[PDB]
From Swiss-Prot, chains A, B, C:
Induction: By stress.
Name of the molecule in the record: 10 kDa heat shock protein, mitochondrial
Modified residues (Phosphothreonine): 77
Compartment(s) of residence: Mitochondrion matrix
Protein keywords: Acetylation, Chaperone, Mitochondrion, Phosphoprotein, Stress response
Species per Swiss-Prot/TrEMBL record: Homo sapiens
UniProtKB/Swiss-Prot annotation, chain D:
Protein name (record): 60 kDa heat shock protein, mitochondrial
Function, as annotated: Chaperonin implicated in mitochondrial protein import and macromolecular assembly. Together with Hsp10, facilitates the correct folding of imported proteins. May also prevent misfolding and promote the refolding and proper assembly of unfolded polypeptides generated under stress conditions in the mitochondrial matrix. The functional units of these chaperonins consist of heptameric rings of the large subunit Hsp60, which function as a back-to-back double ring.
Annotated gene: HSPD1
Top-level lineage group: Eukaryota
Modified residues (N6-succinyllysine): 11, 29, 43
Annotated localization: Mitochondrion matrix
Residues of the full protein shown: 208 to 299 of 573
Amino acid sequence: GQAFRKFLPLFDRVLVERSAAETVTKGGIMLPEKSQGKVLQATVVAVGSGSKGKGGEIQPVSVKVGDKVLLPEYGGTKVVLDDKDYFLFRDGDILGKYVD
Amino acid sequence: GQAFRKFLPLFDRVLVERSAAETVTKGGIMLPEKSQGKVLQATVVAVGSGSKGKGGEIQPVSVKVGDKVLLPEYGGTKVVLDDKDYFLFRDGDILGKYVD
Amino acid sequence: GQAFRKFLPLFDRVLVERSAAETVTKGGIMLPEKSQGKVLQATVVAVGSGSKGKGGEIQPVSVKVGDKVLLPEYGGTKVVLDDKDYFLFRDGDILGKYVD
Amino acid sequence: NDELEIIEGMKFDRGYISPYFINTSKGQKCEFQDAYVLLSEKKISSIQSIVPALEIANAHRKPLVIIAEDVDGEALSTLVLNRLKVGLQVVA
C-alpha cells in the first residue's frame, strides 16, 4: 500500500480528494455555493495496504492511487491534511472508475 | 469486465440504461409525465470485473452487456454520463433477463 | 503484545493518548473550552496481544506502540491511569496512521 | 396650485429588491431597453427554478425583469452575483 502527505490509511481505506466545484454552467450562466452539493467525482491519493479479512494473505486494494472514481453519496469520513479537506472511504464502497 | 464511456463499475456492479418512457398507450390515447413512474425494463451497458467475495478467483458477472433485464423497484444509484442518466445496480439484485 | 503503566488491553484493543487541546488558533486568537470538542489525533501507548478471532494463530495488532493515529469520532472507552485520561479503542476502528 | 400629470404607460408602487441592479450612475435607477419579463405568482425560492429563465436572457442577450411574489435569498444571491460580475442585465 501507498501513502500521502504524512498520512496512511489502514487495512481497507482509500483517501480521496473531491474534484472541482463546478461554479459556472456549461453555456454561460454561473452558480452559487449553497446549491451544487458535494461533487461525486474524485481522485484517489492514498491507498491502504490490503484487506485484513482476507484469510492468510491480505487482499490489496483494487483502486490504485492517481485514479478518478465515482464516489458514493453517504459513506465517508472527513480528514484534514495541510488544511485541505480529503475524504476517507472504504474500498468496497467506491462505485466506479473513470478509465480513459 | 467491460467498460462504458470513460466509466467502469467495480467488483459486482452493473450500469444499465432504462428503456422508453411509454408516452402513449397501446390503442390510441396519450399520457403525461408525472404518471408512468420509472420503467423497469432496461439495457445493460457496462459490467464490473467480478465478485470480490468469491474466495480466491473472482466470480464474473452473469448478465453480459447488451442484454435486456427486469430491474428491481428500489435498489439503485443514479450516475450521469454525457448528460444521460444511467443507473448502477448490483448483480445479485437484477431480477430477470429478457432472452429471445 | 506490549503494555503500558501497569495496564494491558485484551485481544484486540489499543490504548491511545489524545494529543494537545488546541487552546489558541493558528494566527493569534485564543479559544474557550466549551468549543474545540475532542481531538481526533492521538498516540498509541498500549497494544493488546492479538486478535482472538483469528483461527489458530492470533493475528497481532497492526498499529504498533508509539504511532500517531486518526481516531474515529464515537467508538471508545475512557480509562483512568495515574489521573490521565487515556482512551481504549479496537484495532479495526482506528482510521489512519500518521506515518512520517 | 393645481397640477396636471400625464402618466404614459404602466406603473406600480414597488421598487427593486437589491440595490445592486442600479446600472445608471444617476438618480438610483435601473434602466433597460428591449427587456424580457418573467411573471411568477408564488415566490422564487431556489436556484433551480430561476436558472432557466436567466439562461434564456443571457443567450438572447437581453435584459430581464423578474416580477414575482418575492425573490428568495438563494435565487437572489444568484441574481446579484451574475449582476456584479461579468454583468448579466437583470432586476427583481
